Short mmCIF file of C-alpha atoms and ligand atoms in Angstrom, two decimals:
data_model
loop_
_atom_site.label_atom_id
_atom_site.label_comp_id
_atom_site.label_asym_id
_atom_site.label_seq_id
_atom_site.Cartn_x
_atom_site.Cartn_y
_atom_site.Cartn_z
CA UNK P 18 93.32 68.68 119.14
CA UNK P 19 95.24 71.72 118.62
CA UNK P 20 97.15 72.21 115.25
CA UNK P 21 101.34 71.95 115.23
CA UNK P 22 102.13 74.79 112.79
CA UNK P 23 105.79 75.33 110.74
CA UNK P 24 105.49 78.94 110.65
CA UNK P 25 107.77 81.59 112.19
CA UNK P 26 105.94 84.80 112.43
CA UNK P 27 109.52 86.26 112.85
CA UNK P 28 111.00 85.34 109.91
CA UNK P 29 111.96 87.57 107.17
CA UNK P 30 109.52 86.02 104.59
CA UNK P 31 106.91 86.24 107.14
CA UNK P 32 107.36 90.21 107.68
CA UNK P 33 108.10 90.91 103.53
CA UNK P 34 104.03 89.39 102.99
CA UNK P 35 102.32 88.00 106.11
CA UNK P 36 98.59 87.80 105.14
CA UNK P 37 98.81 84.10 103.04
CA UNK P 38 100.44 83.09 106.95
CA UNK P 39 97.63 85.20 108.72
CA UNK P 40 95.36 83.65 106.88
CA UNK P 41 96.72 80.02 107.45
CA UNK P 42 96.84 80.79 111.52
CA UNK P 43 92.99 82.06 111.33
CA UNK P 44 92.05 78.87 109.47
CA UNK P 45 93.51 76.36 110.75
CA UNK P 46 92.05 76.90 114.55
CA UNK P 47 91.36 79.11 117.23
CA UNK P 48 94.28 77.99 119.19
CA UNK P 49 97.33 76.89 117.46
CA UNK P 50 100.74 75.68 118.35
CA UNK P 51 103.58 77.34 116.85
CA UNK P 52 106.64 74.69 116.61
CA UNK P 53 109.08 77.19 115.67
CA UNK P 54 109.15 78.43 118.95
CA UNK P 55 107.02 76.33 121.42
CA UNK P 56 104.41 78.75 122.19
CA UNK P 57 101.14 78.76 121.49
CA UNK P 58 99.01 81.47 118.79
CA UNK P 59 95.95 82.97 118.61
CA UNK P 60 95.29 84.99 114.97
CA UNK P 61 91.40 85.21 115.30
CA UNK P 62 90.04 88.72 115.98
CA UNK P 63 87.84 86.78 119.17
CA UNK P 64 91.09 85.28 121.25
CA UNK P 65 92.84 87.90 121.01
CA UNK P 66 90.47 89.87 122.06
CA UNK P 67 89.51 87.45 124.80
CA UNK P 68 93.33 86.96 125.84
CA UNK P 69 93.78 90.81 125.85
CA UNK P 70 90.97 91.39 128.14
CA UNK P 71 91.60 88.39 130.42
CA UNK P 72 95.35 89.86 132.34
CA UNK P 73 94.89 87.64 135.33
CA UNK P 74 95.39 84.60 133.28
CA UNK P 75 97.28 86.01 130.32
CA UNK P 76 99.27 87.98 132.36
CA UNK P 77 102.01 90.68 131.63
CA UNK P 78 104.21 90.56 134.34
CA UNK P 79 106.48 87.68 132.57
CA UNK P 80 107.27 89.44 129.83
CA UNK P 81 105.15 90.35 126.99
CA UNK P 82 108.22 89.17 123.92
CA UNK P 83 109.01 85.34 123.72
CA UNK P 84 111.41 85.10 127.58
CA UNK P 85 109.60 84.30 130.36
CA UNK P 86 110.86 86.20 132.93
CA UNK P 87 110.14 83.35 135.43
CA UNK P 88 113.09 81.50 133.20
CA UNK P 89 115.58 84.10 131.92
CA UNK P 90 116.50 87.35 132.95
CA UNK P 91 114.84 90.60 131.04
CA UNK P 92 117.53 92.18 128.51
CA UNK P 93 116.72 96.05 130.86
CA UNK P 94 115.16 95.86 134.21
CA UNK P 95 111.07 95.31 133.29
CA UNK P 96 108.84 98.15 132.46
CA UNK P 97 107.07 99.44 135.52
CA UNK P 98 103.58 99.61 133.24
CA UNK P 99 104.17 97.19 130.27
CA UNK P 100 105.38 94.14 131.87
CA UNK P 101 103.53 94.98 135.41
CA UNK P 102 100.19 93.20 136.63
CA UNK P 103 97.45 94.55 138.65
CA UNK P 104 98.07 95.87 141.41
CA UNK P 105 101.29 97.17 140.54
CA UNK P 106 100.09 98.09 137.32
CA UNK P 107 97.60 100.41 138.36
CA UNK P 108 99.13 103.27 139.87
CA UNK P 109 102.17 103.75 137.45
CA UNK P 110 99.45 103.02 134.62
CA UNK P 111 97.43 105.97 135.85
CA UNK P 112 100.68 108.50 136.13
CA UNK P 113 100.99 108.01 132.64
CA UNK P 114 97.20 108.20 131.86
CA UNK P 115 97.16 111.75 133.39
CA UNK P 116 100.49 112.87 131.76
CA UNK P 117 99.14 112.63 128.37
CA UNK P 118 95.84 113.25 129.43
CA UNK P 119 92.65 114.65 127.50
CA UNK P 120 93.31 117.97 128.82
CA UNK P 121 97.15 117.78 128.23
CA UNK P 122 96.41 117.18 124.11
CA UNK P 123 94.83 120.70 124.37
CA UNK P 124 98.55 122.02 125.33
CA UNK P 125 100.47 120.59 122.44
CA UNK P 126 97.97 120.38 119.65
CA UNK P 127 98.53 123.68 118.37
CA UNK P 128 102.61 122.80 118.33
CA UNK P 129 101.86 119.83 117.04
CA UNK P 130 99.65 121.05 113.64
CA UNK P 131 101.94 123.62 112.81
CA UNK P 132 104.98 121.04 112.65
CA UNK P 133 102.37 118.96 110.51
CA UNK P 134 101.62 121.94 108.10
CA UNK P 135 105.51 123.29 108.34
CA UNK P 136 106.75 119.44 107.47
CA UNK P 137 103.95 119.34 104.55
CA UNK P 138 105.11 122.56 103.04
CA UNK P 139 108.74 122.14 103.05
CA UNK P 140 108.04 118.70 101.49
CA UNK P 141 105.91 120.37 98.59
CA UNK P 142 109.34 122.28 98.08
CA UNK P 143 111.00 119.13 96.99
CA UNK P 144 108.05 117.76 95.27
CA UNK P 145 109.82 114.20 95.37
CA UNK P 146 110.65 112.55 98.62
CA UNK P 147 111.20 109.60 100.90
CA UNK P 148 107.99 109.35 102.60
CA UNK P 149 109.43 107.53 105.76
CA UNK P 150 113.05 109.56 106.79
CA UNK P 151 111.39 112.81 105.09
CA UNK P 152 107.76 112.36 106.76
CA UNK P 153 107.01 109.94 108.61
CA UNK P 154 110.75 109.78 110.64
CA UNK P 155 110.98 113.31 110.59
CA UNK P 156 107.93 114.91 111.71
CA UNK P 157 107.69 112.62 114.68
CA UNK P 158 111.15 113.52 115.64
CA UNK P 159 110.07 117.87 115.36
CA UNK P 160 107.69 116.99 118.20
CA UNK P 161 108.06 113.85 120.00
CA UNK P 162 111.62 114.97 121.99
CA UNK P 163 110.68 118.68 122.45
CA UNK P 164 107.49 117.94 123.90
CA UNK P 165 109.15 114.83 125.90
CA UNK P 166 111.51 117.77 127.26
CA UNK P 167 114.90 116.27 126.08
CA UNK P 168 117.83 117.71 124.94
CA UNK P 169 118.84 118.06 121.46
CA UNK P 170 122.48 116.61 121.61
CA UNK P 171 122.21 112.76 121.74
CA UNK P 172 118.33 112.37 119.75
CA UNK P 173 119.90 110.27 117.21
CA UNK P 174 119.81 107.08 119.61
CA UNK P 175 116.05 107.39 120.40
CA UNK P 176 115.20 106.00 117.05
CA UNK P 177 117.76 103.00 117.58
CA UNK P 178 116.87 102.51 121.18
CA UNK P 179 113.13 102.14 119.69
CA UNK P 180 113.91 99.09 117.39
CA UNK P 181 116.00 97.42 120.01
CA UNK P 182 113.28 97.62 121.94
CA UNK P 183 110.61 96.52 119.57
CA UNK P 184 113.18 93.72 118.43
CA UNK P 185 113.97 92.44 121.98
CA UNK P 186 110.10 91.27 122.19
CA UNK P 187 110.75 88.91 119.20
CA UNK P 188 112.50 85.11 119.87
CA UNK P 189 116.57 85.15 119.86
CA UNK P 190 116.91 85.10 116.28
CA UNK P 191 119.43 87.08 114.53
CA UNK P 192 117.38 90.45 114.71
CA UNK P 193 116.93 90.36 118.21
CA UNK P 194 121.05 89.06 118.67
CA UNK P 195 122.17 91.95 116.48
CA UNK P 196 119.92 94.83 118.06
CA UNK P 197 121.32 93.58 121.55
CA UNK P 198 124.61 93.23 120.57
CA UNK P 199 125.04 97.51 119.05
CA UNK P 200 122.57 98.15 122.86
CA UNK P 201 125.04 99.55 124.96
CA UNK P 202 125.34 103.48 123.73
CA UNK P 203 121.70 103.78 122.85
CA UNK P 204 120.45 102.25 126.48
CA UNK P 205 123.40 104.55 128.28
CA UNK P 206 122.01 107.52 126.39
CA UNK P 207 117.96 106.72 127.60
CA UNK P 208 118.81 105.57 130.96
CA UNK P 209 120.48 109.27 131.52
CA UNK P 210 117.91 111.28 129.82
CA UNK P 211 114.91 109.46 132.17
CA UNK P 212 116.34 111.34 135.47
CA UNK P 213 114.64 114.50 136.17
CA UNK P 214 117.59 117.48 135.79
CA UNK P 215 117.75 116.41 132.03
CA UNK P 216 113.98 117.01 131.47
CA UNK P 217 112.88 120.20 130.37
CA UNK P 218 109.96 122.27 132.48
CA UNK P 219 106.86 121.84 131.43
CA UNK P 220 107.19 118.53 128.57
CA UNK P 221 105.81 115.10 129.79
CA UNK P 222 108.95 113.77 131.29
CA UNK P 223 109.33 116.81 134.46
CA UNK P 224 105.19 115.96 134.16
CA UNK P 225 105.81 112.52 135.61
CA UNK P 226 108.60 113.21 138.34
CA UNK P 227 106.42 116.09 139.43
CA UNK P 228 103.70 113.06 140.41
CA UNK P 229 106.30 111.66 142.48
CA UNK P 230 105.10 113.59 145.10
CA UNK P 231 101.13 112.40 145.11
CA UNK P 232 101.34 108.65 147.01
CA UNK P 233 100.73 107.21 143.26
CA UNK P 234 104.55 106.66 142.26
CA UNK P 235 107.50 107.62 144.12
CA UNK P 236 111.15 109.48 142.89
CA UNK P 237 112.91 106.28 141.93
CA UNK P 238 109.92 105.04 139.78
CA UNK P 239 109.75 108.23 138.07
CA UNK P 240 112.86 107.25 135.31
CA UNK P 241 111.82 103.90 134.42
CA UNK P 242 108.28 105.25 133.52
CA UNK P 243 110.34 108.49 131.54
CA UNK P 244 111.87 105.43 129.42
CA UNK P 245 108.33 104.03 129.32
CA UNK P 246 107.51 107.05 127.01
CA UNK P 247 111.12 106.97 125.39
CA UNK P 248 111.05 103.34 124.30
CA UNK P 249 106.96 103.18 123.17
CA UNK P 250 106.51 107.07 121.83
CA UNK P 251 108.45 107.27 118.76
CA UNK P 252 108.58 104.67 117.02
CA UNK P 253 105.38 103.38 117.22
CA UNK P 254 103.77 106.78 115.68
CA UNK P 255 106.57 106.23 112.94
CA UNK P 256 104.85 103.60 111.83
CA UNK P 257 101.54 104.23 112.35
CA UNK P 258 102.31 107.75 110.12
CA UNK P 259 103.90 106.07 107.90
CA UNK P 260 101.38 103.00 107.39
CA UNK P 261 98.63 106.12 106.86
CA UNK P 262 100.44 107.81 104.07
CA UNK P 263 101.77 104.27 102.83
CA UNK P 264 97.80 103.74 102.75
CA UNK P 265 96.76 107.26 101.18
CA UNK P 266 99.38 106.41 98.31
CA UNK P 267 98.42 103.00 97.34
CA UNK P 268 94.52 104.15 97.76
CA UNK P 269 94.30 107.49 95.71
CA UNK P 270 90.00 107.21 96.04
CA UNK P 271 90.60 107.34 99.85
CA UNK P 272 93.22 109.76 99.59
CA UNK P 273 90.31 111.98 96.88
CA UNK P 274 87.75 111.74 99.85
CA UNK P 275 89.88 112.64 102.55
CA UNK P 276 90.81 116.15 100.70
CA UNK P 277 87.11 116.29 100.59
CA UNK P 278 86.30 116.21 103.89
CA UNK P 279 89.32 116.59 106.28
CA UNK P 280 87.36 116.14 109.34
CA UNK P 281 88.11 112.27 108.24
CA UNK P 282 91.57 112.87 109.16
CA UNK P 283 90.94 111.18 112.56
CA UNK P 284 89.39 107.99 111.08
CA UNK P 285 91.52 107.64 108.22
CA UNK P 286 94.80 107.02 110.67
CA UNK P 287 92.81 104.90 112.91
CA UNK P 288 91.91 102.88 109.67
CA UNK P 289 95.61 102.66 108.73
CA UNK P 290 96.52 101.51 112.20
CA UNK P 291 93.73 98.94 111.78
CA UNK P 292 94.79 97.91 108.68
CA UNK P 293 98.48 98.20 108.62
CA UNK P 294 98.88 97.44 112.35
CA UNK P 295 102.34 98.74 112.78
CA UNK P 296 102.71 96.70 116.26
CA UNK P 297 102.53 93.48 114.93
CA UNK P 298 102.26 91.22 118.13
CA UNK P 299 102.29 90.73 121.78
CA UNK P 300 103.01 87.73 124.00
CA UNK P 301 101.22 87.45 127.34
CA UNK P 302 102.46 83.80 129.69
CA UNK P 303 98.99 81.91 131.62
CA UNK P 304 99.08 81.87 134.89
CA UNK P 305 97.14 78.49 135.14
CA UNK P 306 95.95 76.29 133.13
CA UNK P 307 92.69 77.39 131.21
CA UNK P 308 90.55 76.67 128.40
CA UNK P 309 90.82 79.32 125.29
CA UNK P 310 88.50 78.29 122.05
CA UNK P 311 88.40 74.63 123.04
CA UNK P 312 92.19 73.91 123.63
CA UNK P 313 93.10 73.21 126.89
CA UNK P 314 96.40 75.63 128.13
CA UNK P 315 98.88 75.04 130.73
CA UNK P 316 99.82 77.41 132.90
CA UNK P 317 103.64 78.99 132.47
CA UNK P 318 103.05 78.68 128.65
CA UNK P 319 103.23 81.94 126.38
CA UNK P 320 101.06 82.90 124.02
CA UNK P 321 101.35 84.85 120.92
CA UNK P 322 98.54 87.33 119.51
CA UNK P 323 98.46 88.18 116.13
CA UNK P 324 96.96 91.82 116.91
CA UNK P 325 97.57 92.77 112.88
CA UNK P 326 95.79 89.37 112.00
CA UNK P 327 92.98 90.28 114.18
CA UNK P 328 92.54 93.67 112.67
CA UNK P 329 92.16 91.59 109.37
CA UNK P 330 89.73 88.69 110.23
CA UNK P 331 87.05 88.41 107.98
CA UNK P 332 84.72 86.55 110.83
CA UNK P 333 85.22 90.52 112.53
CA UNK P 334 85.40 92.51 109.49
CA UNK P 335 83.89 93.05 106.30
CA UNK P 336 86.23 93.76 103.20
CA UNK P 337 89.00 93.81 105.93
CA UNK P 338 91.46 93.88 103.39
CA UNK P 339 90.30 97.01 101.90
CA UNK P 340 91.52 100.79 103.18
CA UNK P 341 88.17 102.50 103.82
CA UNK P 342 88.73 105.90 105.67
CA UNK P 343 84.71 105.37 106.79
CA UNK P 344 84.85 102.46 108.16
CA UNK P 345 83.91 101.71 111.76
CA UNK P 346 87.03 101.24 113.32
CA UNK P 347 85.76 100.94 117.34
CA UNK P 348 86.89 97.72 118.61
CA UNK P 349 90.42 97.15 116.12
CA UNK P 350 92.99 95.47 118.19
CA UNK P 351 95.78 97.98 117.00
CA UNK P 352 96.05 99.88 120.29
CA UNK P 353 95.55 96.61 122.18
CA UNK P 354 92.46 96.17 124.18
CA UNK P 355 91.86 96.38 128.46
CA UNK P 356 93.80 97.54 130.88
CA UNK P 357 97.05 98.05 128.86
CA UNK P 358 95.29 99.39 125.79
CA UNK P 359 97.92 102.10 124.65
CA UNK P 360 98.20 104.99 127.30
CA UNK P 361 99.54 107.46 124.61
CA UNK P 362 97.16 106.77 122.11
CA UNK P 363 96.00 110.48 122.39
CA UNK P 364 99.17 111.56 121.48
CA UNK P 365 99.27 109.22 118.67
CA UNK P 366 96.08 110.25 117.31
CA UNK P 367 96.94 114.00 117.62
CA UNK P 368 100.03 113.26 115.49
CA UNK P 369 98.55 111.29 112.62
CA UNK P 370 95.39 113.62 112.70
CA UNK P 371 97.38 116.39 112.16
CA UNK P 372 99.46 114.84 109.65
CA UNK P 373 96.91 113.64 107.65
CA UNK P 374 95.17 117.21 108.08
CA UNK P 375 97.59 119.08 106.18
CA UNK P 376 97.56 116.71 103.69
CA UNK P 377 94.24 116.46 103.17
CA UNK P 378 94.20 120.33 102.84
CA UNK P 379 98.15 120.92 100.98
CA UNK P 380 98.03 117.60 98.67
CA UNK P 381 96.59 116.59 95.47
CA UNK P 382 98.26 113.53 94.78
CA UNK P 383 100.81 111.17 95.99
CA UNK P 384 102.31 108.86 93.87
CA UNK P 385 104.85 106.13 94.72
CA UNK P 386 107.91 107.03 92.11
CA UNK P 387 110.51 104.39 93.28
CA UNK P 388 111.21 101.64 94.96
CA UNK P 389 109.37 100.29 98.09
CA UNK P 390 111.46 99.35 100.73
CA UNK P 391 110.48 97.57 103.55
CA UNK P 392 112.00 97.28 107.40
CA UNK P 393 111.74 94.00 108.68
CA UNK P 394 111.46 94.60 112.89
CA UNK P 395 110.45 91.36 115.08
CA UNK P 396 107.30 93.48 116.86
CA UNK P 397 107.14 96.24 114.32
CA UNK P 398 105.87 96.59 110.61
CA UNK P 399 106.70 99.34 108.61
CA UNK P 400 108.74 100.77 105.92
CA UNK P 401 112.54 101.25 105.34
CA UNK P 402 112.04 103.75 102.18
CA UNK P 403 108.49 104.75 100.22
CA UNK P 404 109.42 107.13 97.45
CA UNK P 405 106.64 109.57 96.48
CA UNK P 406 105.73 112.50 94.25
CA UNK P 407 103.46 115.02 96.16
CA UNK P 408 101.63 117.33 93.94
CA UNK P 409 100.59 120.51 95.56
CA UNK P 410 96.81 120.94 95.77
C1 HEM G 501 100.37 104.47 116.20
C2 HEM G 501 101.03 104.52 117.36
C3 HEM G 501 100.94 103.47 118.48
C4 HEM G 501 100.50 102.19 118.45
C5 HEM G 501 99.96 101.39 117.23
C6 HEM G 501 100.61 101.65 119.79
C7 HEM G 501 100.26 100.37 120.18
C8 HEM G 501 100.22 99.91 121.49
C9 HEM G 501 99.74 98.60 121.93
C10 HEM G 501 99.18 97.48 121.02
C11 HEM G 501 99.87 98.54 123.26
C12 HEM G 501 99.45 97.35 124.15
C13 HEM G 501 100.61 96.52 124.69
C14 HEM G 501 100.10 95.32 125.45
O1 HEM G 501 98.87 95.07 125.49
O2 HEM G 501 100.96 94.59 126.02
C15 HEM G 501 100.44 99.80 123.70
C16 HEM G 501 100.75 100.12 125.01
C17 HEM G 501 101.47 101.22 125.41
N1 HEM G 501 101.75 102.32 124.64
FE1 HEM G 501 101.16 102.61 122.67
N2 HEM G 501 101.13 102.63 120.61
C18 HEM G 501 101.32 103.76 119.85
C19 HEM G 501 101.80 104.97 120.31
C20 HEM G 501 102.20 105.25 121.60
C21 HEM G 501 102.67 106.54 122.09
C22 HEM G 501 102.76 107.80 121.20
C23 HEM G 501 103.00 106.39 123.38
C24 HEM G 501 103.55 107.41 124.40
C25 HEM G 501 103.67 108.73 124.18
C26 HEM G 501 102.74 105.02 123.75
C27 HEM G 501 102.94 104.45 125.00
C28 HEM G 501 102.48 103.21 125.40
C29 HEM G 501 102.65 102.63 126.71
C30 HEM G 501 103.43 103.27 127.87
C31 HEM G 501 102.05 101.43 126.72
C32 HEM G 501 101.94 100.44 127.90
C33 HEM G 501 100.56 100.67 128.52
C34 HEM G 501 100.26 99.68 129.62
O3 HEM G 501 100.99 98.67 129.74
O4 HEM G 501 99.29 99.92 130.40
N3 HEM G 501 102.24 104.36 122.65
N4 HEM G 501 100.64 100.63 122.60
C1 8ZU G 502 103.52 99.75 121.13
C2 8ZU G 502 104.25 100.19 122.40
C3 8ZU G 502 104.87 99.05 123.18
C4 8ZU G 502 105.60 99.43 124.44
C5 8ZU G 502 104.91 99.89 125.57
C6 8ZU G 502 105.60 100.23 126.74
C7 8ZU G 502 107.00 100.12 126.82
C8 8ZU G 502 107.75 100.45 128.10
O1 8ZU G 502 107.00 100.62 129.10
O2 8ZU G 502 108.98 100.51 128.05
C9 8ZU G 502 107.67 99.66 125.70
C10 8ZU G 502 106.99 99.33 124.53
CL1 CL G 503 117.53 100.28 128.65
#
């Protein structure tokens, strides 16, 4: 009843072109089983966004990479938010919700463009740069620490921490072996920065001890949700930066009406989260057994969603394999969807707005002018190196 695919989404052909695959996954059911790996798949945008919003029986609280934590033990003591259930999710979950709040945007944003617009100018000095460690590594890095309140000595293992992170959600292949293997200085480095005398007044780490004192998390659960922020901040805006200018160069029409009205800024990153979908995939594990487009699931059994194959499905989307800075992007799985739907996405959205603001307004062109490098990651997709030309406007 339910197809027995070949595939491993975490293989490096897989991550160098994965739509023929996606494609394959979508058509060959709504539930598949994925041999590779003995867990079951879900690529269509409507199971994955069934599983998403379903946590009591595609629960998080076993892991949300390939271990089950009811089998092996987590590589760091589990996320107090990520890899929490309700109840326990709830509290934590809403500490985090309030430190990068609506209201706490309005604190950073004008910090925030003026690193955008500072980054954009200096790069218009060069004229010809690496689009990821010039751009989309670097401006992330001029705001994400500072406003996290960390130090500056030590900044160089956030990025590393990051893809050992985003790695140790993939199966024990060799990308997950290796990033656990080098762990050991990066996780010593976070694990120190997430206790409140090395968090600067005022940035959003001191913000979450100082709502240890409320009833809704107490002292000790303050650093593990600091590393919450420290392992899922970074990274992830990376490559969500990086997919929108990766997008803006391949698509110079979308880039022309984007200078032409910047007030698309906001929809034009949300497009290129849609349609790059930097996270890749989550697992979730059932809880009992239960019936998920006509296959019958056990319970205890994982299952992978293909968030970035959602994003694409044609029986969602139309032309979903186009870049259109217009389109109606409400609903896109690239944030997730329910109750863990990305906490920081504010922050996320600030950063690529104002990005792709002072592009829209410093930029006439950008024109790939070497060769395209890409990172292979087992959660994330992104780019290693994407040479570019940047003509002044
Ligand atoms: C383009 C950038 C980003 C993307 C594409 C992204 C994507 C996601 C996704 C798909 C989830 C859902 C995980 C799940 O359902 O298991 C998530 C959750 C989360 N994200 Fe984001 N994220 C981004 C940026 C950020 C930033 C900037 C922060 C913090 C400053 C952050 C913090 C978190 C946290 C803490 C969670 C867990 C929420 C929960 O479990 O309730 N993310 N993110
Ligand atoms: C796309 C972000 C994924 C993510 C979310 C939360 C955590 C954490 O709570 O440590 C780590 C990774
Ligand atoms: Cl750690």
């Amino acid at each position: 009843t339910i197809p027995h695919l070949a595939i491993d989404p975490f293989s490096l052909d897989f991550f160098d072109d994965p739509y023929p695959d996606q494609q394959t996954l979508r058509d060959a059911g709504p539930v598949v089983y994925l041999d590779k790996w003995n867990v079951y798949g879900v690529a269509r945008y409507a199971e994955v966004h069934a599983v998403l919003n379903d946590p009591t029986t595609f629960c998080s609280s076993r892991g949300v990479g390939l271990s089950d934590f009811k089998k092996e033990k987590p590589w760091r003591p589990p996320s107090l938010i990520l890899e929490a259930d309700p109840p326990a999710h709830t509290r934590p979950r809403a500490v985090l919700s309030k430190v990068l709040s609506p209201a706490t945007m309005k604190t950073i944003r004008d910090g925030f463009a003026a690193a955008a617009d500072a980054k954009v100018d200096e790069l218009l000095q060069r004229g010809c740069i690496d689009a990821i460690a010039d751009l989309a590594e670097a401006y992330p890095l001029s705001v994400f620490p500072d406003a996290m309140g960390l130090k500056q000595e030590g900044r160089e293992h956030l990025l590393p921490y990051a893809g050992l992170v985003f790695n140790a959600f993939g199966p024990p292949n060799e990308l997950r072996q290796t990033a656990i293997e080098r762990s050991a200085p990066h996780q010593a480095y976070v694990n120190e920065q997430c206790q409140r005398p090395n968090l600067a007044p005022g940035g959003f780490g001191a913000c979450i001890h100082a709502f240890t004192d409320t009833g809704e998390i107490t002292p000790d659960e303050a650093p593990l949700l600091v590393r919450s922020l420290l392992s899922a901040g970074l990274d992830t805006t990376v490559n969500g930066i990086g997919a929108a200018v990766y997008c803006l160069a391949r698509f110079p029409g979308e880039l022309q009406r984007l200078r032409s009205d910047p007030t698309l800024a906001r929809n034009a990153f949300e497009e290129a989260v849609r349609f790059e979908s930097p996270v890749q995939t989550f697992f979730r594990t059932t809880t009992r057994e239960v019936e998920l487009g006509g296959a019958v699931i056990g319970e205890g059994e994982k299952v992978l969603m293909f968030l970035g194959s959602a994003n694409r499905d044609p029986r969602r989307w139309s032309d979903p394999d186009l870049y259109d800075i217009t389109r109606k992007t409400s609903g896109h799985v690239g944030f997730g969807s329910g109750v863990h739907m990305c906490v920081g996405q504010l922050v996320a959205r600030l950063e690529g707005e104002v990005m792709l603001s002072a592009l829209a307004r410093k930029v006439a062109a950008i024109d790939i002018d070497g060769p395209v490098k890409r990172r292979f990651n087992n959660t994330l997709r992104g780019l290693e190196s994407l040479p570019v030309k940047l003509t002044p406007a």
